[PDB]
Amino acid sequence: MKLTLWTYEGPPHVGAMRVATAMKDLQLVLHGPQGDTYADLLFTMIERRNARPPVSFSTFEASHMGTDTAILLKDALAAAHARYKPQAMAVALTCTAELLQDDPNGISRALNLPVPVVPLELPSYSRKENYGADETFRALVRALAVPMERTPEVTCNLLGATALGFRHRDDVAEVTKLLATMGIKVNVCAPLGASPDDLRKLGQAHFNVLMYPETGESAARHLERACKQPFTKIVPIGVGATRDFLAEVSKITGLPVVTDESTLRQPWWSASVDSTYLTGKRVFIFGDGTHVIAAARIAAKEVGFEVVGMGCYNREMARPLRTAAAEYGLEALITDDYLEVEKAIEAAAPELILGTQMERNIAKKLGLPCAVISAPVHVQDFPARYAPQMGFEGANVLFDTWVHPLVMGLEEHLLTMFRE
Amino acid sequence: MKLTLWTYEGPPHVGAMRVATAMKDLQLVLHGPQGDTYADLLFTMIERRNARPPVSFSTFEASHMGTDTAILLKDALAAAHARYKPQAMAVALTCTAELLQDDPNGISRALNLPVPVVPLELPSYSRKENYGADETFRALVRALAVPMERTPEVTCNLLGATALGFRHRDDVAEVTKLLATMGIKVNVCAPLGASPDDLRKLGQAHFNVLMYPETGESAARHLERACKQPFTKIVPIGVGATRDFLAEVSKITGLPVVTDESTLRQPWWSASVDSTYLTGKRVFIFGDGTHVIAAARIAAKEVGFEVVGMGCYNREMARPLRTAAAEYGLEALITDDYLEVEKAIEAAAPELILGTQMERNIAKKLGLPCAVISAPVHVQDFPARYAPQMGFEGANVLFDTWVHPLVMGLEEHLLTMFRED
Amino acid sequence: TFGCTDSPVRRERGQKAVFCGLTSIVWLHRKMQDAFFLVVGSRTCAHLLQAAAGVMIFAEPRFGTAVLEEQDLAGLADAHKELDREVAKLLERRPDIRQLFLVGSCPSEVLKLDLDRAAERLSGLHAPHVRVYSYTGSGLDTTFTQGEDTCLAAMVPTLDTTEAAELIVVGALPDVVEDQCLSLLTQLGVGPVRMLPARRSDIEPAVGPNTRFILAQPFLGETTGALERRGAKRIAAPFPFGEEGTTLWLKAVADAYGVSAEKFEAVTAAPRARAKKAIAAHLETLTGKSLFMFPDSQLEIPLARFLARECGMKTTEIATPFLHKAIMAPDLALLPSNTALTEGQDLEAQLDRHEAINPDLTVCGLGLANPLEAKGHATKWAIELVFTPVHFYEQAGDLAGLFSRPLRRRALLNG
Amino acid sequence: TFGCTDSPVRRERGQKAVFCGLTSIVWLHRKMQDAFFLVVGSRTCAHLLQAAAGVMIFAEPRFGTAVLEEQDLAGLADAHKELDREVAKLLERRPDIRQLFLVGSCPSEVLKLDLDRAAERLSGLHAPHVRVYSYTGSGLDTTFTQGEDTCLAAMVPTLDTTEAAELIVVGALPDVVEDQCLSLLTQLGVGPVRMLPARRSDIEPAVGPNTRFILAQPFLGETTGALERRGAKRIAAPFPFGEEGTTLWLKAVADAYGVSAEKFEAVTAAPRARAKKAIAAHLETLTGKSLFMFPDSQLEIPLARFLARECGMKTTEIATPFLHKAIMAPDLALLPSNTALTEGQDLEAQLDRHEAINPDLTVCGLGLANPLEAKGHATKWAIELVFTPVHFYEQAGDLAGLFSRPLRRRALLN
Ligand code: SF4
Ligand code: SF4
Q: Where do the domains of chain A lie?
A: 11-147, 148-237, 238-280+390-420, 281-374
**Cα(C140) to centroid(ligand 1), Å:** 8
> B399 and A384 in contact by Cβ < 8 A?
yes
Task: Tell me the C-alpha distance between C211 and C231, whole Å.
Answer: 7
**How near does any CA of chain D get to the CA of B53, in Å?**
9
**Torsion of the alpha carbons at C39, C45, C50 and C51, rounded to the nearest 10:** -140
Those residues with Cβ within 8 angstroms of residue B80's Cβ, 6 or more apart along the chain or in another chain: B27, B29, B56, B86, B89
Domain shared by D191 and D258, yes or no: yes
Please tell me whether residue D169 adopts helix, strand or coil conformation.
strand
Domain shared by D137 and D215, yes or no: no
The candidate with the shortest Cα–Cα distance to B288, out of B405, B407, B130, is: B130
Domain shared by C4 and C57, yes or no: no
Q: Which CATH number fits domain B11-147: 3.40.50.1980, 3.90.1150.10, 3.40.50.300, 1.10.645.10?
A: 3.40.50.1980
Domain shared by D411 and D381, yes or no: yes
Helix extents (H) in A67-195: 68-84, 95-98, 104-110, 129-144, 168-180
A2-4 and C63-67 as β-strands: parallel, antiparallel, unpaired? antiparallel
- Angstrom CA distances, A23 to A19, A162, A168, A174, stand at 6, 8, 13, 20
Helix A168-180 to helix A391-417 angle (10° resolution) is 130
CATH architecture of A238-280+390-420: Up-down Bundle (1.20)
Please tell me whether residue C122 adopts helix, strand or coil conformation.
helix
Domain shared by C206 and C277, yes or no: yes
DSSP string, B246-305: HHHHHHHH-PPP----TT--HHHHHHSGGGGGGTT-EEEE-S-HHHHHHHHHIIIIII-P
Task: Tell me the C-alpha distance between D309 and D318, whole Å.
Answer: 15
Task: Tell me the C-alpha distance between B89 and B71, whole Å.
Answer: 18
Those residues with Cβ within 8 angstroms of residue C320's Cβ, 6 or more apart along the chain or in another chain: C293, C295, C297, C298, C300, C301, C342, C343
Task: Tell me the C-alpha distance between A354 and A284, whole Å.
Answer: 6
Task: Tell me the C-alpha distance between C287 and A212, whole Å.
Answer: 52
Contact A42, A164 (CB under 8 A): yes
Contact D138, D40 (CB under 8 A): no
Any chain B CB within 8 A of the CB of C56?
yes
Task: Tell me the C-alpha distance between D97 and D341, whole Å.
Answer: 43
Those residues with Cβ within 8 angstroms of residue C259's Cβ, 6 or more apart along the chain or in another chain: C188, C189, C190
Q: Chain-centre distance of CA B338, in angstroms?
A: 20
Residues of C in contact with B271 (CB under 8 A): 373, 413
Give D128's DSSP letter: T
What residues of B act catalytically? 274
Q: Whose CA is nearest to atom 8 of ligand 1?
A: C45
Domain shared by C126 and C231, yes or no: no
Q: Which helix (H) or strand (E) holds B135?
A: helix B129-144
Q: Is the CB of B96 under 6 A from ligand 2?
A: yes
Interface list for chain B against chain A, based on CB atoms closer than 8 Å: 45, 48, 50, 263, 265-266, 268-269, 272-274, 379-380, 383-386, 393, 396-397, 399-400, 404, 407-408
Q: Is the CB of D41 under 6 A from ligand 2?
A: yes
Of the candidates D59, D373, D405, which has its C-beta nearest A418's C-beta? Answer: D59
Instruction: Indicate the residue among D252, D281, D310 that finishes a domain.
Output: D281
Contact D291, D308 (CB under 8 A): yes
Could you tell me where the beta strands, DSSP code E, fall in C151-297? 167-170, 193-196, 212-215, 233-234, 290-293
The candidate with the shortest Cα–Cα distance to B287, out of B311, B252, B257, is: B311
Contact C213, C167 (CB under 8 A): yes
Those residues with Cβ within 8 angstroms of residue D350's Cβ, 6 or more apart along the chain or in another chain: D12, D294, D317, D319, D342
Q: Quote the domain boundaries for residue D221.
A: 159-281
CATH code, B238-280+390-421 = 1.20.89.20
DSSP string, D288-299: T-EEEE--SSS-
Contact A302, A269 (CB under 8 A): no
Q: Is the CB of C42 under 6 A from ligand 1?
A: yes
Instruction: Indicate the residue among C95, C123, C158 that finishes a domain.
Output: C158
D193-196 and D212-215 as β-strands: parallel, antiparallel, unpaired? unpaired
Please tell me whether residue C213 adopts helix, strand or coil conformation.
strand
Domain shared by C41 and C77, yes or no: yes
Which chains sit next to D, with 3 or more Cβ pairs under 8 A?
Answer: A, B
Domain shared by C102 and C166, yes or no: no
Give B43's DSSP letter: I
Instruction: Indicate the residue among D226, D260, D281 that finishes a domain.
Output: D281
Task: Tell me the C-alpha distance between B382 and A400, whole Å.
Answer: 10
Q: Judge if the upstream peptide bond of residue B191 is cis by omega within 30 degrees of 0.
A: yes
Question: By what method was this entry solved?
Answer: X-ray
Mutate to test the pocket of ligand 2, among D16, D18, D20, D24 (most ligand atoms within 8 A of CB): D20
Contact D136, D107 (CB under 8 A): no
- Angstrom CA distances, D236 to D210, D255, D256, stand at 16, 11, 10
Q: Is the CB of D18 under 6 A from ligand 2?
A: no
Count how many residues are written for chain C.
Answer: 415
Domain shared by C406 and C305, yes or no: yes
Q: Is D364 annotated as a binding residue?
A: no
Q: How many CB pairs under 8 A join A and D?
A: 40
Domain shared by D202 and D127, yes or no: no
Please tell me whether residue D342 adopts helix, strand or coil conformation.
strand
Of the candidates D50, D368, D370, which has its C-beta nearest B49's C-beta? Answer: D370
Task: Tell me the C-alpha distance between C12 and C321, whole Å.
Answer: 10
Of the candidates B13, B36, B125, which has its C-beta nearest D73's C-beta? Answer: B125
Task: Tell me the C-alpha distance between B168 and A415, whole Å.
Answer: 29
The candidate with the shortest Cα–Cα distance to B57, out of D140, D43, D343, D366, is: D140
Task: Tell me the C-alpha distance between A160 and A214, whole Å.
Answer: 8
Q: Whose CA is nearest to atom 4 of ligand 1?
A: A36
Q: Is the CB of D22 under 6 A from ligand 2?
A: yes
Closest ligand 2 atom to Cα of B35: 3
Q: Which CATH number fits domain B281-374: 3.40.50.720, 3.40.50.1980, 3.40.50.2000, 3.40.1190.20?
A: 3.40.50.1980
User: From the candidates A96, A131, A341, which should be mutated to test the interface with C, based on the most C CB atoms within 10 A?
Assistant: A96
Task: Tell me the C-alpha distance between A87 and A89, whole Å.
Answer: 7
What residues 322-381 of chain B have any CB closer than 8 A to a CB of chain D?
Answer: 358, 361, 378
Supply angle C-alpha B355, B359, D91, rounded to 5. 145
For chain D, state the CA radius of gyration: 22
Q: Whose CA is nearest to atom 8 of ligand 2?
A: B36
CATH class of B148-237: alpha beta
**Cα(D121) to centroid(ligand 2), Å:** 25
Of the candidates D30, D369, D406, which has its C-beta nearest A418's C-beta? Answer: D30
Task: Tell me the C-alpha distance between A82 and A85, whole Å.
Answer: 6
Those residues with Cβ within 8 angstroms of residue D263's Cβ, 6 or more apart along the chain or in another chain: D188, D189, D254
Through-space distance between the first and last CA atoms of chain A, rounded to whole angstroms: 54
**Torsion of the alpha carbons at C93, C94, C98 and C101, rounded to the nearest 10:** -60
| Cross-strand bridge partners of residue A90 | A28, A118
Those residues with Cβ within 8 angstroms of residue A236's Cβ, 6 or more apart along the chain or in another chain: A175, A178, A242, A244, A245, A246, A390, A391, A394
> B271 and C373 in contact by Cβ < 8 A?
yes
Q: Is B68 annotated as a binding residue?
A: no
Task: Tell me the C-alpha distance between A189 and A193, whole Å.
Answer: 7
Task: Tell me the C-alpha distance between A394 and A264, whole Å.
Answer: 9
Any chain B CB within 8 A of the CB of D237?
no
Sheet holding C233-234, edge to edge: C193-196, C167-170, C212-215, C233-234
Any chain C CB within 8 A of the CB of B116?
no
Domain shared by D215 and D294, yes or no: no
**Cα(D221) to centroid(ligand 2), Å:** 22
Domains B11-147 and B238-280+390-421 share a fold: no
- Angstrom CA distances, B297 to B283, B291, B325, B345, D398, stand at 12, 10, 10, 19, 52
The candidate with the shortest Cα–Cα distance to B219, out of B158, B137, B157, B143, is: B137
The structure was resolved to a resolution in Å of 2.8
Domain shared by C253 and C289, yes or no: no
D406: domain CATH number is 3.40.50.1980
